[PDB]
């Protein structure tokens, strides 16, 4: 049990690092997604804005 525990605890803590690494990567991907969404938004809106202003001519 000490060995199985060391493995369960080691695997748990390691896997917990995989949890925090995947989680961190998810947050970073979300910050990137957000930034991407923000740029998308900003561009579509900048164009739609400018286009509305410039529909005419």
């Amino acid at each position: 049990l000490s060995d199985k525990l060391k493995e369960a605890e080691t695997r748990a803590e390691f896997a917990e690092r995989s949890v925090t690494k995947l989680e961190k990567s998810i947050d970073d991907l979300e910050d990137e997604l957000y930034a991407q969404k923000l740029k998308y938004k900003a561009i579509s809106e900048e164009l739609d804005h400018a286009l509305n202003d410039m529909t005419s001519i």
Partner: peptide, 29 residues
Amino acid sequence: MDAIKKKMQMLKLDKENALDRAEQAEADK
């Protein structure tokens, strides 16, 4: 953009039309 292309032409037309009016009117006046 259709709005820009057309309305730019409309402003060009205000010039072209105003100019034709200016020229004809001035030719007589």
